[PDB]
């Protein structure tokens, strides 16, 4: 049923980019802060270079489809892969998201985050996920930890390691066993390993709840060994303090057992953007009307969202 994926995968030279700094390091290798300078194009692009140490051919093999997936997507609210570099240790180059993880940002700036931003972030994630649904794609790991902050007003969806494409006939994806983020998953995902766009809506609901609680742990202090029994018994995450019943009504609908009864991402865009126009009415935060939120040379620097191929 499907159209040809004529997306372009760009192979980069190691001499094409400069490494300024190390953001983080792990057994999975080290992420570098750097600038990408296309040979003779007079442009410097702030990048995140994530490239790994002890490679197993299994590790290599599909660090690569994450790259396959990211190269295929093109949306203002989705992290686009800039290119890869086939060194001794394979190089993956993405757009730099300076403020980093959204989960860490709301924990760090919980004192200076207004209702306007929170509602905006909800819309943008909803837009990004809606683009993913159009591309017949299921993320399978949507969480606040996997939304990156370009600017406080611009966020993008990331971590496509578990993402899967759906065939034209396909409506559900049936997975295989492995370690999974239980407390973000839909009930059918936990029980029958079944995933869908609606299973992302569930996960989308939890992500919002995280933001509204400024980074609280979902079902904190309760063992994951039977989150799914509790979900069957009818219990859900509590209503965040700042949340009007309006906003919390929306989260609850995402946690419906009948996946078809859950809101589509295109509708979540509408409702949250409806509330985004009158923020104070839908999110009660103290000192809300007074809050404001906002590295190496910088003459030829262009952001990746402005550099088109």
């Amino acid at each position: 049923g499907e159209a040809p994926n004529q997306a372009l995968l760009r192979i980069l030279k190691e001499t094409e980019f400069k490494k300024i700094k190390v953001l983080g390091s792990g057994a999975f290798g080290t992420v570098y802060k750097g600038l990408w300078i296309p040979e003779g194009e007079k442009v410097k692009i702030p990048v995140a270079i994530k490239e790994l140490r002890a490679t197993s051919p299994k590790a290599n093999k599909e660090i690569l489809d994450e790259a396959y997936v990211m190269a295929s997507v093109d949306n203002p609210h989705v992290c686009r892969l800039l290119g890869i570099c086939l060194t001794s240790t394979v190089q993956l180059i993405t757009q730099l998201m300076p403020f980093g993880c959204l989960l860490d940002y709301v924990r760090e700036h919980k004192d200076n985050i207004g209702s306007q931003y929170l509602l905006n972030w909800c819309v943008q994630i909803a837009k990004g996920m809606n683009y993913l649904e159009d591309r017949r794609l299921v993320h399978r790991d949507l969480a606040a930890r996997n939304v990156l902050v370009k600017t406080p007003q611009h966020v993008k969806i990331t971590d496509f390691g578990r993402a899967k494409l759906l065939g034209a006939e396909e409506k559900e994806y049936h997975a295989e066993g492995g370690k999974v983020p239980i407390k973000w998953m839909a009930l059918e995902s936990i029980l029958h390993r079944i995933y869908t766009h609606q299973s992302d809506v569930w996960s989308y609901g939890v992500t919002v709840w995280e933001l509204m609680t400024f980074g609280s742990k979902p079902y904190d202090g309760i063992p994951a060994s039977e989150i799914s029994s509790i979900l069957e018994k009818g219990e859900r995450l509590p209503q965040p303090p700042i949340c009007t019943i309006d906003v919390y009504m929306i989260m609850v609908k995402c946690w419906m057992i009948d996946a078809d009864s859950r809101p589509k991402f295109r509708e979540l865009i509408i409702e949250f953007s409806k509330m985004a126009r009158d923020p104070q009415r839908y999110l009660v935060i103290q000192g809300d009307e007074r809050m404001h939120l906002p590295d190496e040379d910088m003459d030829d620097v262009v952001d990746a969202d402005e550099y088109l191929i």
Binding site: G177, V180, P181, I182, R193, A224
Partner: peptide, 7 residues
């Protein structure tokens, strides 16, 4: 510490 064993 939030990736779990699925039965």
């Amino acid at each position: 510490t939030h990736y779990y064993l699925l039965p």
